[PDB]
Design a binder for this molecule. Structure first.
Ligand SMILES: Cc1cn([C@H]2C=C[C@@H](COP(=O)(O)OP(=O)(O)OP(=O)(O)O)O2)c(=O)[nH]c1=O
Ligand SMILES: [Mg+2]
Ligand SMILES: [Mg+2]
Lengths: 412, 555
DNA sequence: AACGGCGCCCGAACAGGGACTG
DNA sequence: CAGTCCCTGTTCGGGCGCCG
């Protein structure tokens, strides 16, 4: 009894045609069981080869969850309907969410299955379930309702979501609620007991209308930044000062007031790397002045809502991972460091997967966007393992880089 | 008035703004004329082909060819112009079934649907877009023109439509027989079960009649009731499988198209025959772009071809997959960037073999290539068995630990154990993490002129040692590598080297042991001879130490 | 002389970043 | 500051194998 909101692709773009990648046995068996129930409930329908569109599908398990969740890689379809969920029916981003003491993320994607999808658009939601050893051809489906993981789903459901959350927002005017993709971000300054109590009250508001029982908690007020720091040694060698000048010279691309004159004078000649060089009176003054500039904020660095976020990650070794978020080069909106994540000292791909998920979560809370990642990994290595460790209901854009560490800029 | 078949039609459209095919016929031999007039007449009585008139302004040529070890003819329409104007279909065939993925089945039956494409109907509103005339005489009778009521062989939509229609017909039968495995590839159906031979034929007959309700015939000509079953080009036995006999051509003179077929058969044979190499053979297919050009076999390509023929002498076979046992993948290094592997569950009972000999990157090492081989095997194992095997790798745990913890990119290998079978994979040198006390410090630099391609390369040390070497036909990057090579040549066993070349530093830090660059290979040879090497980087043109001094010499 | 699927090894065309020159 | 070069990377199309 609901009129389907008309959805159109961006002008001059066809639907997604992305090949399905091989799935493990446990994931195929999970997707066959999930899709059989969804088909019995009318959420999806089987289709034929006359539909030239296709989107990859796999399954994940969220943190501390033993239940399989279907996950569609709608990244290609999302950026082909970008004028819809950003221009027509956009969701405003609250600047106070990042200031809250506690923020709980609730999976509300199951609510989208109650709204029908535009018949003229259902063909673009096509996905294919593979078979082991290619026993049977692909089993193709398309969505009859709003699909999870499609940016158009929260946009169309937003009118429905506002009416459901209206009594709770009136009951609690201080609580900030943000919706992104299949998730609901609920932030409050209440105590941990009061917060979790108010979260359960919000769950009951949704029940009176399969992952609603979970609640991933965040604390953006505890989120830290990793600035550029300079070493502090009792004695300095030629090699130490060469690395310092190399670091400060690269850092001058960000802070224009950094000088290296008095420090380069210490290296006059052709000296051995291990020769100890005592810092002169001017070198102490110049190095002290440079340590203060690195504490001062960078001039003219602010967020532009019309520009894409970019995230670079560096593998620092020993479980250490540094990252920077920016829109323009050397205009970092945020820099951070992660240490001792899951897979530390044993699995780089799991740690990198964890780091990408953390960075994306922070970007959704702070700006309401997911950044495009520059991943320090080979394409074939990432594409072999990343789905094994993915625990999020969204997927960010990424590319693959290879930058040897000439200077340890973000972690000495 | 043609009857509508029980198989649900597939709605096929065309690309907007385009019409149907209008291509003139091709003059063929009189042998093809007497081999197609009888087909269009038999298919007309059976309802597979209807006759049209002048109200269909389309035409498409069609030739024919013989079959595989048979006496029947294959009608292949040349719909290349129709395919350019027909809508795109998403292929549901995602790969090729491999016998190493089949599980143990007590009873096995292989079927083959007769007239596969000719038993599935075409879209009602699309039959008009398939017009073609048939002249009885090459230059006399104009010939009555017909159309297609089924799937033509040669149309780009015929495979996808048949594979999807066949699945919908089998879906109810598979739901009624869950314990029966049906491998469905095109028209051939692999049916297996753990039932007794008597009860197995019962369900086979039930399946043959189930398919008969939609017009799909399973004749006794290609019905296989006893091993060895010929399925997907393999010989399937109750407890083992092998590839059908592979014949390698043995010509006295070798050209280009002969080697392309030779390397192709060796790639197909390497799935069960361990230790097949095609490096030196494929190396002959470089540069020359004349398929009909004779190429003499080099001494390396001749010995490589001789060792492959001796592997194919002894008969080999693979086993089937037992999900109750683990998957094991063991890799060996064959040298020269060549890797071979075996996947098994019980020792010396290979499910399948294979090779990885891809050379990616101008500079690399054995640890990087071993990582790439592990990834290729992992993805291959997920396609065939849906799981990753435990690996047995010829690399020490300590070697791997040193590499991945120190590398700047993320890299990883799944659960694996060390197998002590030489040649072991190791890192041939390790750059120091700190400058070396007591080692001479070399400040290297190189510059070249963009126009004359002339350049200099040299160094300056803390002990006063100095060198400048003029170079001809070089680049800035080559002189930077040459400067480092000079420092390694003229230093002791322990040396500190300071450069401003991000290019040169990035190559050496990745610890390559092989390179397409002779200069890098010479650098690698020097790095192995050393006991301690510390590479440091400084920014150029900043008046930093000896780097400023050596910059004046080479520029 | 046809269609689709997968794999390999090949080369041409392309993109992207340090570094030099006007 | 642009416009090149040098160098290295990926993408893709065709050669071949094999299946139907
Ligand atoms: C071998 C082959 C096959 N096909 C298509 C057509 C029917 C299916 C199966 O072909 P087939 O089994 O060999 O012949 P088929 O038409 O089924 O007739 P039968 O020989 O089984 O009686 O794939 C094709 O288009 N080109 C080919 O070269
Ligand atoms: Mg057949
Ligand atoms: Mg230099």
């Amino acid at each position: 009894p609901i009129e389907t909101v008309p959805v159109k692709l961006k002008p001059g773009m066809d639907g997604p045609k992305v090949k399905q990648w091989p799935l493990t046995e446990e994931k195929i068996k999970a997707l066959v069981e999930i899709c059989t129930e969804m088909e019995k409930e009318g959420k999806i329908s089987k289709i034929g080869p006359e539909n030239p569109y296709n989107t990859p599908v796999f399954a994940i398990k969220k943190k501390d969850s033993t239940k399989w969740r279907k996950l569609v890689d709608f990244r290609e379809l999302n950026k082909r309907t970008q004028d819809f969920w950003e221009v027509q029916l956009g969701i405003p981003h609250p600047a106070g969410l990042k200031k809250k003491k506690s923020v709980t993320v609730l999976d509300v994607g199951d609510a989208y299955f109650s709204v029908p999808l535009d018949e003229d658009f259902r063909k673009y939601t096509a996905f294919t379930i593979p078979s082991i050893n290619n026993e049977t051809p692909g089993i193709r489906y398309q969505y009859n309702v709003l699909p999870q993981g499609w940016k158009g789903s929260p946009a169309i459901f937003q009118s429905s979501m506002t009416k459901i959350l209206e009594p709770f927002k009136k009951q609690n005017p201080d609580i900030v609620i943000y919706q992104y993709m299949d998730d609901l971000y609920v932030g409050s300054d209440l105590e941990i007991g009061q917060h979790r109590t108010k979260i359960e009250e919000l769950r009951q508001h949704l029940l009176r209308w399969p992952f609603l029982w979970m609640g991933y908690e965040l604390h953006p007020d505890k989120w830290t930044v990793q600035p550029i720091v300079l070493p502090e040694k009792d004695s300095w060698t030629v090699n130490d000062i060469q690395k310092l000048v190399g670091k400060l010279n690269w850092a001058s691309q960000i802070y224009p007031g950094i000088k290296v004159r008095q420090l380069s004078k210490l290296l006059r000649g052709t000296k051995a790397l291990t020769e100890v060089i005592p810092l002169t009176e001017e070198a102490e003054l110049e190095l002290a002045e440079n340590r203060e500039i690195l504490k001062e904020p960078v001039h003219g660095v602010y967020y532009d809502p019309s520009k894409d976020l970019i995230a670079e990650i560096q593998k620092q070794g020993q479980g250490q991972w540094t990252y920077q978020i920016y829109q323009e080069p050397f205009k970092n909106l945020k820099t951070g460091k992660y240490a001792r994540m899951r897979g530390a000292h044993t699995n780089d791909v799991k740690q990198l997967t964890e780091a990408v998920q953390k960075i994306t979560t922070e970007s959704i809370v702070i700006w309401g966007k997911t950044p495009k990642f520059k991943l320090p990994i080979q394409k074939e290595t990432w594409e072999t393992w990343w789905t094994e460790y993915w625990q999020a209901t969204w997927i960010p854009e990424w590319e693959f880089v290879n930058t040897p560490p000439l200077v340890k800029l973000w972690y000495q | 008035m043609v009857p509508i078949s029980p198989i649900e039609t597939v709605p096929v459209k065309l690309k907007p703004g385009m019409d149907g095919p209008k291509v003139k016929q091709w003059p063929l031999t009189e042998e093809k004329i007497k081999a197609l007039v009888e087909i269009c007449t038999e298919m007309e009585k059976e309802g597979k082909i209807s006759k049209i008139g002048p109200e269909n302004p389309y035409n498409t040529p069609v030739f024919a060819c013989k079959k595989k070890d048979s006496t029947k003819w294959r009608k292949l329409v040349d719909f290349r112009e129709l395919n350019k104007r027909t809508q795109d279909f998403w292929e549901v065939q995602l790969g090729i079934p491999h016998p190493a993925g089949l599980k143990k089945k007590k009873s096995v039956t292989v079927l083959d649907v007769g007239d596969a494409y000719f038993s599935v109907p075409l879209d009602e509103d699309f039959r008009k877009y398939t017009a073609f005339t048939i002249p009885s005489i090459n230059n006399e009778t104009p010939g009555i023109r017909y159309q297609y009521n089924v799937l033509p062989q040669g149309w780009k939509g015929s495979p996808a439509i048949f594979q999807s229609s066949m699945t919908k017909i089998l879906e109810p039968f598979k739901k009624q027989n869950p314990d029966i495995v049906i491998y469905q590839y095109m028209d051939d159906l692999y049916v297996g079960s753990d039932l007794e031979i008597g009860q197995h034929r019962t369900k086979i007959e039930e399946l043959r009649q189930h398919l008969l309700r939609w017009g799909l015939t399973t004749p006794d000509k290609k019905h296989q009731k006893e091993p060895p079953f010929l399925w997907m080009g393999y010989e399937l036995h109750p407890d083992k499988w092998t590839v059908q006999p592979i014949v390698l051509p043995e010509k006295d003179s070798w050209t280009v198209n002969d080697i392309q077929k030779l390397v192709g058969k060796l790639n197909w044979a390497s799935q069960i025959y361990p230790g097949i190499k095609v490096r030196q053979l494929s190396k002959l297919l470089r540069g020359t772009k004349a398929l009909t050009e004779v190429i003499p076999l080099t001494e390396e390509a001749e010995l490589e071809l001789a060792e492959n023929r001796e592997i194919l002498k002894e008969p080999v076979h693979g086993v089937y997959y037992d999900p109750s046992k683990d998957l094991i993948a063991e890799i060996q290094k064959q040298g020269q960037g060549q890797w071979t592997y075996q996947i098994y569950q019980e020792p010396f009972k290979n499910l399948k073999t294979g090779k990885y000999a891809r050379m990616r990157g101008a500079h690399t090492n054995d640890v990087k290539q071993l990582t790439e081989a592990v990834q290729k095997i992992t993805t291959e194992s997920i396609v065939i068995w849906g799981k990753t095997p435990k690996f047995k790798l010829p690399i020490q745990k300590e070697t791997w630990e040193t590499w991945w913890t120190e590398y700047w990119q993320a890299t990883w290998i799944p659960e694996w154990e060390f197998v002590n079978t030489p040649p072991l994979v190791k890192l041939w040198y390790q750059l120091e993490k700190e400058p070396i006390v007591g080692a001479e410090t070399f400040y290297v630099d190189g510059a070249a002129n963009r126009e004359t391609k002339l350049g200099k390369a040299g160094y300056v040390t803390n002990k006063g040692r100095q060198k400048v070497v003029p170079l001809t036909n070089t680049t800035n990057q080559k002189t930077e590598l040459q400067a480092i090579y000079l420092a390694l040549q003229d230093s002791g066993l322990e040396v500190n080297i300071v450069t401003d070349s991000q290019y040169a530093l990035g190559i050496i830090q990745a610890q390559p042991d092989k390179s397409e660059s002779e200069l890098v290979n010479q650098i690698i040879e020097q790095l192995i001879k050393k006991e301690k090497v510390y590479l440091a980087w400084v920014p150029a043109h900043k008046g930093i130490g000896g780097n400023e001094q050596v910059d004046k010499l080479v520029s």
